[PDB]
């Protein structure tokens, strides 16, 4: 799962 | 030194004097099993032998080991009694 806003990207490994 | 805690390690059949006194030569395999319970170890390699090992290993206060070795003939009748109470 991941999100991006104001040109900042963060991702979470799920499972 | 070894101040670390170690749990009590127990192995084998629980043996008591009143139970071992029941066993005498000539009594059948089923009778021995009834008197002492089924053994947790017996000779896999051919011979008909029962090992009533009674290991108690406390935390750090030494170790005790009583071995009761029971030999049965081909018909399943007890023929020899070996009882080592030490080592």
């Amino acid at each position: 799962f991941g999100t991006i806003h104001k040109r900042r990207f963060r991702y979470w490994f799920c499972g | 030194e070894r101040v670390v805690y170690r749990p009590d390690i127990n192995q084998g059949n629980y043996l008591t004097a009143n139970d071992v006194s029941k066993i005498r030569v000539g009594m059948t395999q089923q009778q021995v099993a009834y008197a002492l319970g089924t053994p947790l170890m017996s000779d896999p390699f051919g011979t008909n032998t029962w090992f009533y090992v009674f290991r108690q290993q406390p935390g750090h206060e030494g170790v005790t080991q009583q071995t009761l070795t029971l030999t049965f003939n081909s018909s399943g009748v007890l023929t020899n009694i070996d009882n080592k109470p030490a080592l």
Partner: protein, 217 residues
């Protein structure tokens, strides 16, 4: 989701999406065929395609349920060797972990339930139908599964050697020598049994195990 349609046009696109490898919507179309049309002439191949698609989509519990349904409903179908091989495949893929495979962790120390299920599965396949086209690979997988199931017991015996549980070591290696006599894990676990015999002053049994090791040196 899926519209109501006569058999041919919906099975055609189901077959097209499955035969193009698009498993996710292939499952949806085939499930539409399954629930709308349970007893049509297509039903057998639809269930087989469900098995194949669920296996390919890594939906292994659903694949196992479909294989159970197929075996229970049609015990005498001409291609039950395929569903038995697929059942073994689902179990043997269920005995896996992607991250641990990537990092090279040996999974023999882990839960052997699915490996035992796969062994029983492939053994039934190779015993019932030796001439099936999946039987050679089934036997190769049987050899691998036997080795894995031996290594699990070897790991347990190694732990009890670390613990100092000598009766447990002796019993575990005896069970190894009884169930998996010809495995390399049993060959390696024989010294553990000899050591456990020596630790309880059982010199005669230790000598017998030493004779076995020397004869197989």
């Amino acid at each position: 989701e899926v519209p109501d349609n006569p058999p041919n046009e919906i099975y055609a696109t189901a077959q097209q999406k499955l035969q193009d490898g698009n498993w996710r919507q292939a499952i949806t179309q085939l499930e539409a065929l399954d629930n709308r049309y349970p007893f049509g002439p297509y039903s057998q191949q639809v269930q087989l395609d469900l098995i194949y698609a669920y296996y390919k989509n890594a939906d292994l519990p659903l694949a196992q349920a479909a294989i159970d349904r197929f075996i229970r409903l049609n015990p005498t179908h001409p291609n039950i060797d395929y569903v038995m091989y697929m059942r073994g495949l689902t179990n043997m893929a269920l005995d896996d972990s992607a991250l641990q495979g990537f990092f090279g962790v040996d999974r023999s120390d882990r839960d052997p339930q699915h490996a035992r299920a796969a062994f029983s599965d492939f053994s039934k396949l190779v015993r019932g139908y030796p001439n099936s086209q999946y039987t050679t690979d089934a036997t190769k997988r049987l050899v691998f599964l036997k080795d894995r199931l031996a290594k699990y017991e070897y790991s347990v015996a190694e732990y009890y050697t670390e613990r100092g549980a000598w009766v447990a070591v002796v019993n575990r290696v005896e069970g190894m020598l009884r169930d998996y006599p010809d495995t390399q894990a049993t060959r390696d676990a024989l010294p553990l049994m000899e050591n456990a015999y020596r630790q309880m002053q059982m010199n005669a049994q230790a000598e017998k195990v030493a004779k076995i090791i020397a004869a197989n040196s």
